[PDB]
Amino acid sequence: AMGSFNSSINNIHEMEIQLKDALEKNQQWLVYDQQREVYVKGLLAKIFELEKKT
Amino acid sequence: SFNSSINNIHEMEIQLKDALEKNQQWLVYDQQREVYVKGLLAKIFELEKK
């Protein structure tokens, strides 16, 4: 139908929105995880000093 | 041409299925890393009692 055609066009609008939002989120996971790695490397260096005291 | 535009929409769908598969991988990976960080702290705790 011509109504099913019109509806199917609107999803394709949502799809773009979904791509855009998911794209900027995997992109934010990078910054977040890069920061956690700073913390982890800190803890590891800290554990390594507590092991010299053993 | 329209057939050129429909091809892009097909590509857009491929990219979304990808951006969503990776977003899930980020989630599961995140939970594992958080469990890991707690382990490191738990080990720091045990080492400090000495």
Binding site: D21, K25, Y32, Q35 | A19, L27, D30
Partner: peptide, 14 residues
């Protein structure tokens, strides 16, 4: 509008 992002951009944000 459903796909997940990180709790923050800084760590931890607790």
């Amino acid at each position: 509008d459903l796909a997940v992002g990180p709790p923050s951009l800084n760590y931890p944000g607790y």
